[PDB]
């Protein structure tokens, strides 16, 4: 009884790749954590 989120992958790619910075890594993990772990991807783009 578990669900595997893509959040691991976003953070992983941003962890292993030299191209992604330290700040980039947090924002990177923020996107997959927020859009796939915190909220549903029902909407194409958030309202703001």
Swiss-Prot record:
Coiled coil: none
Domain of life: Eukaryota
Tissue: Expressed in seed.
Cystine crosslinks: none
Family classification: Belongs to the 7S seed storage protein family.
Primary role: Seed storage protein.
Name of this protein: Vicilin Pis v 3.0101
Part of the full-length chain shown: 26 to 71 of 545
